[PDB]
Amino acid sequence: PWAVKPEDKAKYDAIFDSLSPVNGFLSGDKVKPVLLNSKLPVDILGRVWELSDIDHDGMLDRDEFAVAMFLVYCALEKEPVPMSLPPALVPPSKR
Amino acid sequence: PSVTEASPWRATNPFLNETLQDVQPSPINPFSAFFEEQER
Ligand SMILES: [Ca+2]
């Protein structure tokens, strides 16, 4: 039950596309300021990045980013964020 | 004492460069309304 429900995924694909991505991947120079879309600090944003980029290719794939931004709302939505990888949100594409 | 550079991330991270070249917030925020409420 991948955390990024297709509704949120598609929504994330919307912000994704709005950044003019690279082959369906976005990188930190673009992603980070979409991370800074929140009032969150780079420590959590970075931790989220390091978790959200499953393949650790240095880019956030449509799924990997959907993961990231899901975790970003998680913090804003007053929900404590994990430092370990919750397999409910490990992209089935990247498994 | 070799620890002036101690970025605690795994190199793949673009935030481990904190307080040097990080201040680049984009007006792409989906959290625009969040900042208006905050307390809840
Ligand atoms: Ca990746």
From Swiss-Prot, chain A:
Q: Which residues form the EF-hand domain?
A: 40-75
Q: What positions belong to coiled-coil segments?
A: none
Summarize tissue expression: Ubiquitously expressed.
Recorded consequence of changing residue 49 to A: Loss of interaction with STON2 NPF motifs
Q: What is known of its domains?
A: The EH domain interacts with Asn-Pro-Phe (NPF) motifs of target proteins. The UIM (ubiquitin-interacting motif) repeats specifically bind 'Lys-33'-linked ubiquitin.
Q: Relate the protein's function as given in its record.
A: Involved in cell growth regulation. May be involved in the regulation of mitogenic signals and control of cell proliferation. Involved in the internalization of ligand-inducible receptors of the receptor tyrosine kinase (RTK) type, in particular EGFR. Plays a role in the assembly of clathrin-coated pits (CCPs). Acts as a clathrin adapter required for post-Golgi trafficking. Seems to be involved in CCPs maturation including invagination or budding.
Binding partners and assembly: Interacts with SGIP1. Interacts with HGS; the interaction bridges the interaction of STAM or STAM2 with EPS15. Isoform 2 interacts with HGS and AP2A2. Part of a complex at least composed of EPS15, HGS, and either STAM or STAM2. Binds AP2A2. Interacts with AP2B1; clathrin competes with EPS15. Binds STON2. Interacts (via its SH3-binding sites) with CRK. Interacts with SH3BP4/TTP. Interacts with ERBB2. Interacts with FCHO1. Interacts with FCHO2. Interacts (via EH domains) with DAB2. Interacts (via UIM repeats) with CORO7 (when ubiquitinated at 'Lys-472').
Implicated disorder:
A chromosomal aberration involving EPS15 is found in acute leukemias. Translocation t(1;11)(p32;q23) with KMT2A/MLL1. The result is a rogue activator protein.
What this protein is called in its record is: Epidermal growth factor receptor substrate 15
Organism in which the protein naturally occurs = Homo sapiens
Annotated gene: EPS15
Span of the full-length protein shown? 121 to 215 of 896
Swiss-Prot record, chain B:
Q: Where is this motif: NPF 2?
A: 29-31
PTM annotation? Phosphorylated in vitro by PKD.
Tissue-level expression reads: Ubiquitous.
Transmembrane region(s):
none
Task: List where in the cell it is found.
Answer: Cytoplasm; Membrane; Synapse, Synaptosome
Top-level taxonomic group: Eukaryota
Residue positions of the PTM Phosphoserine? Answer: 2
Motif range (NPF 1) = 13-15
Assembly and binders: Interacts with the second C2 domain of synaptotagmins SYT1 and SYT2. Interacts with EPS15, EPS15R and ITSN1. Interacts indirectly with the AP-2 adapter complex. Interacts with TOR1A and COPS4; the interaction controls STON2 protein stability.
Return the domain comment text from this UniProt entry.
The Asn-Pro-Phe (NPF) motifs, which are found in proteins involved in the endocytic pathway, mediate the interaction with the EH domain of SYT1, SYT2, EPS15, EPS15R and ITSN1.
Q: Which family does it belong to?
A: Belongs to the Stoned B family.
Please describe what this protein does: Adapter protein involved in endocytic machinery. Involved in the synaptic vesicle recycling. May facilitate clathrin-coated vesicle uncoating.
Q: What is this protein called?
A: Stonin-2
Q: What gene is this protein translated from?
A: STON2
What portion of the full-length protein is represented by this chain? 301 to 340 of 905
